[PDB]
Amino acid sequence: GYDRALSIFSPDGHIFQVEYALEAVKRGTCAVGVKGKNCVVLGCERRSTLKLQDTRITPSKVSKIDSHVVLSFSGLNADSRILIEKARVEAQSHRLTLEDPVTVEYLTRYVAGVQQRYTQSGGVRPFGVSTLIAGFDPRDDEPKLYQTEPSGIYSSWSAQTIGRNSKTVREFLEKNYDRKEPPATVEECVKLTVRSLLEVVQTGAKNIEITVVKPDSDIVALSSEEINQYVTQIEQEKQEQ
Amino acid sequence: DRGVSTFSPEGRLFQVEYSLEAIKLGSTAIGIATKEGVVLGVEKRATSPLLESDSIEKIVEIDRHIGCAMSGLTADARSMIEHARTAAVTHNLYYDEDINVESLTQSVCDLALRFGEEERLMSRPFGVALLIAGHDADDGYQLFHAEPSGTFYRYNAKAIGSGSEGAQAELLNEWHSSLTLKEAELLVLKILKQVMEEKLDENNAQLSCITKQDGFKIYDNEKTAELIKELKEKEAAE
Amino acid sequence: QFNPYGDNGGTILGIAGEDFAVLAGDTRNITDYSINSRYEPKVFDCGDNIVMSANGFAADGDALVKRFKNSVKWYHFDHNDKKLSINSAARNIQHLLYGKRFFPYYVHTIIAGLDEDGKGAVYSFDPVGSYEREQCRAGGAAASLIMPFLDNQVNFKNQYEPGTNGKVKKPLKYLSVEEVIKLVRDSFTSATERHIQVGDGLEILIVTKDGVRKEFYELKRD
Amino acid sequence: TTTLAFRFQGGIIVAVDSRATAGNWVASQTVKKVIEINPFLLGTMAGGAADCQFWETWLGSQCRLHELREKERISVAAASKILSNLVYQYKGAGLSMGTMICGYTRKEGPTIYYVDSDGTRLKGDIFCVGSGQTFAYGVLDSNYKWDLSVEDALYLGKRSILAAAHRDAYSGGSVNLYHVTEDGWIYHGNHDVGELFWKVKEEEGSFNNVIG
Amino acid sequence: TQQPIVTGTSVISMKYDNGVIIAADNLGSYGSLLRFNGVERLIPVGDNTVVGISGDISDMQHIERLLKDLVTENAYDNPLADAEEALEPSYIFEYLATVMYQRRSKMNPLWNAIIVAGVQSNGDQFLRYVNLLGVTYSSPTLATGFGAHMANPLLRKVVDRESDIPKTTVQVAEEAIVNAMRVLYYRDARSSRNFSLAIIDKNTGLTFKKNLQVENMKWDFAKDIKGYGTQKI
Amino acid sequence: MSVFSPDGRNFQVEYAVKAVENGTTSIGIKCNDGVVFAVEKLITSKLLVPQKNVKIQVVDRHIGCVYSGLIPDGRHLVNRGREEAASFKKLYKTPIPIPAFADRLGQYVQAHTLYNSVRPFGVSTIFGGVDKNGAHLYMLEPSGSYWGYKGAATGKGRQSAKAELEKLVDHHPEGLSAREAVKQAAKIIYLAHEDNKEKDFELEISWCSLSETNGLHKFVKGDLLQEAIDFAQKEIN
Amino acid sequence: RNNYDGDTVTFSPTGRLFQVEYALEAIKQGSVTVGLRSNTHAVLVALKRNADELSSYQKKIIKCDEHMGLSLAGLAPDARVLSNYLRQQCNYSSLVFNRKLAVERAGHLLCDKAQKNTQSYGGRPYGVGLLIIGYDKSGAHLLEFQPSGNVTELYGTAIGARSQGAKTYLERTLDTFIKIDGNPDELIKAGVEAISQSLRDESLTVDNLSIAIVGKDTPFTIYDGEAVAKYI
Amino acid sequence: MDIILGIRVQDSVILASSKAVTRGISVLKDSDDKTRQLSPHTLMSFAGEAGDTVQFAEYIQANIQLYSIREDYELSPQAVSSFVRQELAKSIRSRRPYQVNVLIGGYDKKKNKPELYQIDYLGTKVELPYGAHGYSGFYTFSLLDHHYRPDMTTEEGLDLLKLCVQELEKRMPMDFKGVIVKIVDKDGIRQVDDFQAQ
Amino acid sequence: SLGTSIMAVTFKDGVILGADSRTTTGAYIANRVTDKLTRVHDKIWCCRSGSAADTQAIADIVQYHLELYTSQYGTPSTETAASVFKELCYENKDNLTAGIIVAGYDDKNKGEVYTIPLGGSVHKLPYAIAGSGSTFIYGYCDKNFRENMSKEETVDFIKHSLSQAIKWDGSSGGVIRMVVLTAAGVERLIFYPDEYEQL
Secondary structure, eight states: OOOOOOSOBOTTSOBHHHHHHHHHHHHSOOEEEEEOSSOEEEEEOOSOOOTTOOTTTSOOSOEESSSSEEEEEEEOHHHHHHHHHHHHHHHHHHHHHHSSOOOHHHHHHHHHHHHHHTTSSTTOOOOSEEEEEEEOOTTOOSOEEEEEOTTSOEEEBSEEEESTTHHHHHHHHHHHOOSSSOOOSHHHHHHHHHHHHTTTSSSSTTTOEEEEEETTTEEEEEOHHHHHHHHHHHHHHHHHO | OOOTTOBOTTSOBHHHHHHHHHHHTSOOEEEEEOSSOEEEEEEOOOSSSSBOTTSOOOEEEEETTEEEEEEEOGGGHHHHHHHHHHHHHHHHHHHSSOOOHHHHHHHHHHHHHOOOOOOOOOSSOOSEEEEEEEEOSSSOEEEEEEOTTSOEEEBSEEEESTTHHHHHHHHHHHOOTTOOHHHHHHHHHHHHHHHSSSOOOTTSEEEEEEETTTEEEEEOHHHHHHHHHHHHHHHHOO | OOOOOOOOOOEEEEEEOSSEEEEEEEOOEEETTEEEESOOOOOEEOSTTOEEEEEESHHHHHHHHHHHHHHHHHHHHHTTTOOOOHHHHHHHHHHHHHHTTTSOOOEEEEEEEEOTTSOEEEEEEOSSOOEEEESEEEEESTHHHHHHHHHHHTTOTTOBOTTSTTOSBOOOOOOOHHHHHHHHHHHHHHHHHHOTTOOSEEEEEEEETTEEEEEEEEOOOO | OEEEEEEETTEEEEEEOOOEEETTEEEESOOOOEEEEETTEEEEOOBOHHHHHHHHHHHHHHHHHHHHHHTSOOOHHHHHHHHHHHHHHTTTSOOOBEEEEEEEETTTEEEEEEEETTSOEEEESEEEEETTHHHHHHHHHHHOOTTOOHHHHHHHHHHHHHHHHHHOTTOOSEEEEEEEETTEEEEEEEEEHHHHHHHHHHHHOOSTTSOO | OOOOOSEEOOEEEEEOSSEEEEEEEOOEEETTEEEEOOOOOEEEETTTEEEEEEEEHHHHHHHHHHHHHHHHHHHTTOTTTTTTTSOOHHHHHHHHHHHHHHHHHTTOOOOEEEEEEEEOTTSOEEEEEEETTOOEEOOSEEEOHHHHHTHHHHHHHHSSSGGGGGGOOHHHHHHHHHHHHHHHHHHOTTOOSOEEEEEEETTTEEEEEEEEOOOSOOOGGGGGOOSSSSOOO | OOOBOTTSSBHHHHHHHHHHHTSOOEEEEEETTEEEEEEEEEOSSTTBOTTOSOOOEEETTTEEEEEEEOHHHHHHHHHHHHHHHHHHHHHHOSOOOHHHHHHHHHHHHHHTTSOTTBOOOSEEEEEEEEETTEEEEEEEOTTSOEEEOSEEEESTTHHHHHHHHHHHHHTOTTOOOHHHHHHHHHHHHHHHTTTTOSSOEEEEEEEEETTTSTTSEEEOOHHHHHHHHHHHHHTTO | OTTTTSOSSOBOTTSOBHHHHHHHHHHHTSOOEEEEEOSSEEEEEEEOOBSSSSBOBOOOEEEEETTEEEEEEEOHHHHHHHHHHHHHHHHHHHHHHSOOOOHHHHHHHHHHHHHTTTTBSSOOOOOEEEEEEEEETTEEEEEEEOTTSOEEEESEEEESTTHHHHHHHHHHHHHHHTTOTTOHHHHHHHHHHHHHTTOOSSOOOTTTEEEEEEETTEEEEEEETHHHHTTO | OOOEEEEEOSSOEEEEEEOOEEETTEEEESOOOOEEEEETTEEEEEEESTTHHHHHHHHHHHHHHHHHHHTTSOOOHHHHHHHHHHHHHHHHTSSSOOOEEEEEEEEETTTTEEEEEEEOTTOOEEEESEEEETTHHHHHHHHHHHHOOTTOOHHHHHHHHHHHHHHHHHHOSSOOOOEEEEEEETTEEEEESOOSOO | OOOOOEEEEEOSSSEEEEEOOOEEETTEEEESSOOOEEEEETTEEEEOOBOHHHHHHHHHHHHHHHHHHHHHHOSOOHHHHHHHHHHHHHTTGGGOOBOEEEEEEETTTEEEEEEEOSSSOOEEESEEEESGGGGGTHHHHHHHOOTTOOHHHHHHHHHHHHHHHHHHOTTOOSOEEEEEEETTEEEEEEEOHHHHTTO
16 A cells, blocks of 8 residues: 655756665675677675685576576665566576567566666665676577666666766776777686676685676676686786786 | 555655656657658667677657667566557558557556556556657657656657756757758767767667658668768768 | 347359459348348448458447448548558458457458459458458359359460360459459349349449449349 | 468468358358458468457567567567467457468578467467368378478468368358568468369369259 | 346337327236236336336336436536436337446346337437347337237337328327226236326327226137037037 | 533534635525525635526525535535435425424434544534424524524524524514515625635525415526525625 | 644634645646537647646546546546546446446535545545536536536636636627527637736647537537647 | 376486377477476376466466475475376366376485376376376287386386377377377486487 | 235334235145244334345344444434345346335324335335235225224234234135334234134
């Protein structure tokens, strides 16, 4: 019975609840994504460490929607769980009726669809979540990366980041990413991604996690040491200069 | 605070008026009608270079004989297209014929005032406007402006968004009873080039038409690119 | 148990000409061996140069006619007084009939008029909405006694030019509105003799670009 | 009723008859049993005339919406499933249909799905459905080669409907032929059975025991 | 769904030069038990319409009470209730016919056979039939139950067709009816001797006659009929 | 609404009363075998069709109602009135007794003062008729309060009228034949028109009497309406 | 006003529904339209507004049945919602009673449908004014409908901005037009003049002007453009 | 019914499943695969009422795949059956009951054991060494009871099935157009494509 | 079920209801002393026939209605009471087997009798007879009923008419009950076999 209109216009023409919802995304731990010639990479900052937490079981920022698509987010963790569940269902329902998994643009659209319905339905507030959704369409090699906001607006990106200090790292990438010369290798790509975060992280491989998505449902999460080979390399490369 | 479907003392709906304010902030979009077709064009406005400039669709197909361009909180327009597309296909199914463009528009507009607290589950009005352009065999080529106020108007040409008054004025002057399709294509391009902050090019602008002949087509970045350099040359000489 | 259906008999006929079309039905409404009315009209002008008849269980037929007429009326309100094309009308009816797919309208229904090129058009339906544009169609009690006749005198089926060996069929020439009317009456007077549910009267509705005109012929009352 | 449809290097041949009876009463022989769902897709009619026609016409409306939302041609796999899944919602309520959903997409080649009102959905190469089916499968199974020329395939198809139209009381009128290519279907016309029969017995020498 | 229990029998009618005449016996049968003899099955609405009803009486009683409410409600916020905007036969009928059809359609019929006789604002004779299935029809003569089979043959010989209506007078037509009522009393085991009759006329208006009887019968030949074949006494 | 102010009253009702007071006057007079209803209809313009904006409503066949205040609310109440009078009858057979009816409205109006998401009625309704045992005149405030009456009036010229009524009660304790009450009311509408005499006004009178209307409710029209208008014009001039 | 005009379910200390009054303002700022009638016809003349020279003129007239239709001023969508409601009642009265709906009665209904929005919470009062004409079993009729729930029957009247001028001209013309019985084109001119009296800035022409008439033998029809040229 | 056979050997689980689909008088398809892969190490053969049969299997598969992804884990071949049984239990007092019979053949990677489960349309689950649905057991069980050995090599399993299929081909009236055979083991699910004249 | 032998006769001072006493299920007499006279209001009673379960559940629900009615509109007419019975019997024709006679006393109307047979129809009458045993006394009752009878005469008329019904109808038997309704209150009578058989 509770349908009070929580998301509403104000004289200037804004819906303050959608904006306060972005304010919550700017609070979140940074998230970034970049696509190479033949791969897509996702990076994510994580507070400190922390010397007394348990990492194996505790929710890791990158989630799998299907075997060929993943999702990353900044903002309210509790909220993102809701978008991940719904998204994972629409994935398997798509398979069940269309006999083909989702395209990255289709899934991305569905999520942004939810995000929007919560800016226009009564008794509910928008999601304090913005996302990077990345993968490969089935029987396709060309890489895909998309971003969705609490507005319900979505769009594709060669590189993008969201969350705290996102502005710094977008400015970094706006300089360090050539549309004509996109990171030809996995390695070449994972490097740029580790570096984009190293403006905002304040330590090496402790906070950074990387997930590498390559065609035909090929996804792997780099374990700290491999990330620390890019960290070891980046601090001495900048040095010489 | 004070209710959603509340009236001001001037007899306006605060929300519908505050909705229109959100539209003024939207990307520009122009539409021009002719005896040869209707042309719609838009300003993509990519907030960063990195953003893949063609995943920005502000012109969509509603049916083979109807297209529509949008301005403002574009996210809100998803529901409206979905309904418009359904409405048009449904009608085809019940009558084995195309829906008249007015009818299609009037259906979209109904949707717009269904908000509040029939069975109007929707908390606020849409925060987006639509130019709707198509062709039926009764009233040939047509353009409509569909506000979140539920009202629509037919236009021989019209702009919505950031540069609308400057472009409407410029449209008032430039539009004549007998422009060709290609003249109209150019005025859209010209008038967009005036009001857009950026230097109009094939990646921050898109152009489309709807002819009785081939229905609704969105001009690919190549074809529009040639029309831009067709302007620079048409303008250069006087 | 209560049976919700019944049969009021009657026979109806639809024929399409080059620039015209007819929809004729007998006038006699019945129940078993009783006559309910020697004059109860079965064919209706529904506006937009559409005529129709829903033969069979006249209650379900009345219901159906009322609905379609009203569908027209709303098509005008809802779509800026646009004229309802005969095909568009045929489609609408399929939706009406199929709405009651699991509790059918107990009727065989037919409409006539002119397509959008002004050519004579007839459509025939199922009780559940299967429709097909037709050239010539009888429906009702006597439909069996009429169809073979028309196949023969309208479509010249089984005829050949004399001395042709049986190798060259009769030319399929285009009939008038007045040769068609002869066949319509000759069909109904023939049926009248062999079917106990066909008699009294024969009212015909003719549709040409000039509009919807009507004619009526007395029929044997036994 | 005799409906059939096969897959070959040239795509798909589809062929049906025209007769519709009400017991022993031949009500019409001018019945479209090939449903032109849309320019790339076809469906045959067996069992419920309205049921097939109505629901497949609807399929066309569902396939349109799909293309609008995904800016892409619908797979035959997914268009058949739409019809199938709907039908399954109504299972037990009396719907009658036995139809082939035919189409040729870039992605999947020429595909044919059988969908009946029991919910059954099956991908196949050759399907005949109806009162004439047993007859048509005989002719079909004898001359079926993946390498029939478009032109023979059309004939094998037409001939099969003829074979059934002849024996089946319930099949007759004419034959409607269709050739489905990746670029869409092409109507290969109507053929009065009466006339076809004679012509065919003379070209082929078959129907020997039929005096004439 | 249901089945009739207390039932009304033949309701007959026809039209003449100025108006219409309708009649129905005054019996509420209970199977073969002739249980209730004071039943009026003629229900007058306005001064211009009369509704004859056959079938389930429980149901009739309900129709009757719908008709009172129709009048009641027609007057509401209607300053011309008893004038231009008075209930017209065409209106009263369409309403019932609507209700009867809706009812068969909810598989829950009003188990009746109704005849609505009357005269319209512009002098026109109105007379139409409607029953449990929603089937509606009209003709110069209309009857239900046995009347359909016995009364019509007779009444039709007076008004065989439309042209005949101007030639039939009220005395010619009223005698036809009174005869048919007799013939039905002779040959319908579910009939009553007492009946009511009503005339709606464009000049005389509505005249409603209760407590009639079938008179001038012939039973004298009976005394001579003996045995069933060869018996002589 | 449904909020007591610290004084025990409900301010929203109290304001709905203001609306009523802003209203045209209407009255009721009980007579010895029925009741009479009367109302002033202001002529806003010479464009109103005289005798065509009838404000007195009939309930069932034997009850009349008249109101002052928010005309639409009034109808909305008479609509519930009709629904209620049909219900009662359908089940109980008899046409609804007046006092029973008065409570049916009294419970429903009062219902609209119990919730703060529903506004109370903006009319004061005068109604009444003839039942199984006598005549009854009732008047019903937005409060849901209602009582039987010898005479009643509500609206702008409510006292001008209550004064004229208090006299008829005193100077006529024997009774007051319907016909007399019709004229007497007409006079009271003319006198009460003094307060709100800016505009010209149209008279409207209905009556329900066992002898004159056989128990049914009817609109005093034509001749008998002229006598009434005459009778009144004499005691103004 | 602060508290009392926040919603419709609230009476001001002076007994007023402020939202209702505010919705009347939209009418007063609505483009003028006029109604007037005789004994044989009833006419609606309506001035149309436009947003631009490139804009169309928004229709102020809607048909409701074969023998009835109306004219508006205020919010268009609310006219649509009410004229659609009205289309169904006429239709219901036809379908079920084979009876044409009486003009008077349509007024009662639109009055009751509007009144519920002035009493219920969550809902706003309608924001549109309407003039309705029709030839029913008792002749020609004109009604003035107000969002408040107040419908009134008249010979003539006007609503919209500046409508006061045309209304006064009708108070005068009264005894003349009442009697334009049997004359269609004369009743239209009489209405067309009335409309001029509340005109001011511009001057009626083909695109502006819209006219409707119903009557004894004339089914309700609308005329716009070339078809109204004959009266300018 | 069609032939649904199942046999649990030492290292794996073999599932046979006829290739004929018949509608009334004509055999519509001679190459059907009455099986759905629910999870890398879990296969489900099915037989019964037309339409229901697949709707169910695809519906189950979807939920397992959804589960698999939500917990990035593979459910135990036991768990899966317990879920599948629960769904058939619901179907039984349902408005219209699914009339589908199944066999779950899985390889539990935790216990490193192959498991076979047969569950009828009523939701009657029992875990076996060799199972069968419908009349299939009537011909075959006499043979399996005799020759079956819990320590058999997969090839011994396939040999025992071959002998089962032959008897089905000899004494059973319906011509089921041969069987499709698949093995579920620690490495996954694969189809013995050479079960013709082995 | 009450199958039954019941009647209600209006006379000069008011009305008398009468009924047998036997309720059978098959041939076994479940209860041979049933009070088939049921009170829905002080001076408005009914006699029940057809399904006990039903007739009781109904009488009970009518009583309730008449009690609430009484609380707010004062006393109800025998007519208003009959109406309530019928509204229930008619609006539920499909699930009821009840044939009820309604009898009451208004001071204005004196005796009134309304019969409500299976359909749910209503018929007001001078007297009424119902139940299994009423088919046998149609002849007798009609021949001997007389309007405005003495109370003594009306009791005889009922006692005779019922004695006959009991005689022939196996489904009816026992004692003969009667309820008298006049301005002088409510009287309850009873006649044993040894008495009514000897007529």
